[model samples]
Target: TRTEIIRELERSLREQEELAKRLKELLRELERLQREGSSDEDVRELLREIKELVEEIEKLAREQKYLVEELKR
Candidate 1:
């Protein structure tokens, strides 16, 4: 049972890590678009979406840390 729980937690952590990477990539793209003077509505929308995703990923990481501590106990 503990192994199963740990496995699931690891999966969640990996997913969060992937999400964070995606968010970072999007942020870089947004910066590139800004540098290129491309003021498209889609770029603005994407930036907003990326910000929200980063927030969510941070929350997930915090939760993952809590789960890890519990598992250690």
Candidate 2:
């Protein structure tokens, strides 16, 4: 069980890193939209993307507590 847990965590670590990378990409999207004089709707879409990430990241944060507990044990 412990070994499997570690294996899963390793994969999940990559997923979490990918989320962070996407976060940066979204910020760049805002910049691109601004530079291109894109519509307000585009900005709103980016805002919504960030809103989703905030909620998703909170869930991930809560999930970390268990991983910490697992590692501790």
Candidate 3:
């Protein structure tokens, strides 16, 4: 059990590092978009990018439903 948990932690840590890098890039892009102007049209592409991120997150969250049911067993 400990090994299973440890592997999960290690896997998540590696996943998070990649997420952190992508987030940093998103942060830089956010600043650039902000400094240029505060326009929805100006930032439309970024909005789409962010929307995709949230969409994926939501999809992942929905996937947890199966685990929730599994745990009930």
Candidate 4:
């Protein structure tokens, strides 16, 4: 059970990292659009999505850390 749980945790971390990377890319695109003086509702939506992804990543990271500590026991 522990092994299975750890595997799942690792998967979650990887997914979070991927999501974060995508969000970073979107933020960069948004910056470029802003510099070009182009405005779109999608940019604001992307920002909100990025914020939520960051929060999820933080939560997952804490859970992973806690699991790792438990495994050490």
- The number of the candidate with the highest TM-score is 2
> lDDT of each model, Cα atoms only?
0.83, 0.80, 0.64, 0.81
Order the numbered candidates by TM-score, best leading.
2, 1, 4, 3
lDDT of 2: 0.80
Candidate 4 TM-score versus the reference: 0.71
Using Cα atoms with residue i matched to residue i, what is each candidate's TM-score against the true structure? 0.74, 0.78, 0.53, 0.71
Candidate 3 stretches with Cα past 4 Å from truth are 1-24, 37-42
Candidate 4 lDDT tens digits, 1-39: 789778877787788889889878988987887887665
Task: List the pairs of residues colliding in candidate 3.
Answer: none
Q: What is the model-wide C-alpha lDDT for candidate 4?
A: 0.81
Q: List runs of model 4 lying over 4 Å from the truth.
A: none
Return the TM-score for candidate 1, rounded to 2 decimals.
Answer: 0.74
- Compared with the true structure, what per-residue lDDT tens digits does model 1 show for residues 1-73? 6797698798888888889789889889888888887758978788789988878888887888877887888
Model 3 / residue 73 / CA error / Å = 1.0
Worst 10 residues of 3 by lDDT: 63-72
Q: Candidate 3, 17: how far from true, in Å?
A: 7.5
Clash number for each model: 0, 0, 0, 0
